Amino acid sequence: SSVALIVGVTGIIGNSLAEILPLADTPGGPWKVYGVARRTRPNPINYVQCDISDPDDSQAKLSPLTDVTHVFYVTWANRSTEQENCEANSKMFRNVLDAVIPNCPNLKHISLQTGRKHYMGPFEIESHDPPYTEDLPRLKYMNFYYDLEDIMLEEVEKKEGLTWSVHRPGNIFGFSPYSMMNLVGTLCVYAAICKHEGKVLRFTGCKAAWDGYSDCSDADLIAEHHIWAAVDPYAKNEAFNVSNGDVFKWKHFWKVLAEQFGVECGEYEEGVDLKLQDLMKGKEPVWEEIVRENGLTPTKLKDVGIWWFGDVILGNECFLDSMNKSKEHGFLGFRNSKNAFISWIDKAKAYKIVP
Ligand code: NA
């Protein structure tokens, strides 16, 4: 009966879904699960190698998956322009729904993950006032999230009883061995390099990030949120924010990261805005030495140190969201973000990404 198709299983959320779904006490259980991704390689889950952006390969790989009941859409193309983000991401989404909906007679629910950029315009009101809420109108700017929702909504009409849910996290704290968008990983690699070079963990970000309130969204809680919507009647045909239930300051998270690598913590330096891309320019050889000296997973810096992403997060103000609707609709999940941050650092170490 309960059969998951995780679309993007090698990603950060894909991985959390991959670990949690098959567990004995998981709601909706016991689950059979398929994990789909572009890579070959690498256990209870039924792996399918598929390129979602190829109409033929999606037709070939997903049509035979006759028994799936719930799809979890957690993949995204990231392009140079937003217009391209729409062409690319729509094509992918359509390709999966066109391969699944016709061929799965027990399809109950598609769960779509987007993000907090639903609420955020380019710049450039027009804008929204935080904390962000779910059902206040869409901003007038182009946004591939909006396009994905409309596709989903349109495709839900072509089968009766088929439900949907949208999941909108903020900045994700998580892990996967292959992630190419890992904030926590990225900060671990920066910390590791500072330790190696005998340098202080200088703060690489703005003041609003250092001293303001921020939140974040745990990879495992986001997975639980997806699962909740799969099984809860009050979650059906609704969009929802997912964040941790608490608030933090980078001022304090920086010390925690410092402590986890035994490196001197830096403080907010007035008079700049300090970037990871700049500080880590030319560190490719230094990283290889760290990987060799310690018996690490053989990685290149560009695959584990995603600086532009970390800078985008640490160089801007964090606008908070609201968990009221999720709670009101019955999702009482939370995380203690400082503890979760330590936990995801530990996970980077356990997989020998970082020493
Ligand atoms: Na956690």
Determined by X-ray
CB 75 within 8 A of CB 63: no
Structure tokens at 123: 């710049």
Q: How far is the CA of 105 from the centre of ligand 1 (A)?
A: 35
What residues make up the domain containing 137? 1-355
CB 253 within 8 A of CB 338: yes
The total of structural domains in the chain comes to 1
Q: How many Å apart are CA 172 and CA 292, to the nearest integer? A: 29
Q: How far is the CA of 121 from the centre of ligand 1 (A)?
A: 30
Binding-site residues sit at 10-12, 38-39, 51-52, 75, 113, 145, 172, 179-181
Cα-Cα-Cα-Cα torsion 35, 20, 181, 55, nearest 10 degrees, comes to 20
Structure tokens at 301: 């810096």
Q: Catalytic residue positions?
A: 117, 145
Q: How many Å apart are CA 230 and CA 240, to the nearest integer? A: 13
Q: How many Å apart are CA 11 and CA 15, to the nearest integer? A: 6
* Region of residue 257 (phi > 0: left; psi between -120 and 50: alpha; otherwise: beta): alpha
Q: What is the CATH number of the domain that holds 95?
A: 3.40.50.720
Binding-site residues for NADP(+) sit at 10-12, 38-39, 51-52, 75, 113, 145, 172, 179-181
Question: Phi/psi at 25 (nearest 5 deg)?
Answer: -95, 5
Give how far Cα 342 sits from Cα of 67, 147, 246, Å.
Answer: 38, 36, 16
Q: List 110's β-bridge partners, or say none.
A: 71, 164
Q: How many Å apart are CA 45 and CA 22, to the nearest integer? A: 8
